[PDB]
Amino acid sequence: ELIKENMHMKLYMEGTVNNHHFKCTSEGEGKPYEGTQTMRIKVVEGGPLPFAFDILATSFSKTFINHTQGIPDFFKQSFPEGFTWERVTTYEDGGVLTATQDTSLQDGCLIYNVKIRGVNFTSNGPVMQKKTLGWEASTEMLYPADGGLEGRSDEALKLVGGGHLICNLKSTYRSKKPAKNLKVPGVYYVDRRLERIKEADKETYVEQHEVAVARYCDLPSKL
């Protein structure tokens, strides 16, 4: 098929957080049906970043989600043309991070193009002070809206000294495939874990891994 059991991916990112312009590239391979992936990321302009790389983690891959219970896969289905996503991440201590993304397929390779804008990160806050330690696992709830798909989740960023800092994520995903074609699923949930595997030279180079699984609610119901 178009989406094989193993996929390479290539990424290019550009953006400005608190006015510091920057640019990244990455290369990754994953298993789309397993829901596993790995990215090796290079900060190729504006390094070293004056802020925690972790606020960029969730912007480096929806094709790599294990869809199970015959849950229609909005993302896999929209190939070959691809899909886009855009998101607002609202941190509880001021910072807002806006991301827009295009996803495509050239030469059997997945091609991501990402723009980022981060504003209002307090200068003494744990993001600008580089005091974060990766993300906790999370659940995103997905529901049909306006022909596209909407996503919502709360994320917990781990802190130095223990304790977490929370942010809220509103995501929107739109397919580039003709509408009539693909089945949009009902309401569903994606459990994910995003781990930093390796970093070198103050986060100039980062390795990330993600595992992700789609599920209905496994619980019994009186309705």
Binding site for its own copies (CB under 8 A): 136-139, 141, 143-145, 150, 152-154, 156, 163-164, 166, 168, 187, 189, 191-193, 195-197, 209, 211-213, 217-223
**Minimum Å distance from CB 179 to its own copies?**
16
Contact between 198 and 207 under an 8 Å Cβ cutoff? The reply is yes
Tokens 């059997």 sit at which residue?
108
Nearer to its own copies, 21 or 152 (CB): 152
- Tell me how far, at minimum, the Cβ of 79 lies from its own copies, in Å: 25
SS3 171: strand
Beta carbon nearer to its own copies, 38 or 103: 38
Minimal distance, residue 143 CB to its own copies, in Å: 5
Smaller CB separation from its own copies, 111 or 156: 156
Q: How far is the CB of 159 from its own copies (least distance, A)?
A: 10
Which of 93, 155, 99 minimizes the C-alpha distance to 120? Answer: 93
Distance separating alpha carbons of residues 194 and 209, to the nearest angstrom? 6
Judged by beta carbon, residue 109 or residue 145, the one nearer its own copies is 145
Are 130 and 51 in contact, with CB atoms under 8 Å apart?
yes
Measured over the CA atoms of residue 125, residue 130, residue 136 and residue 138, the dihedral's sign is positive
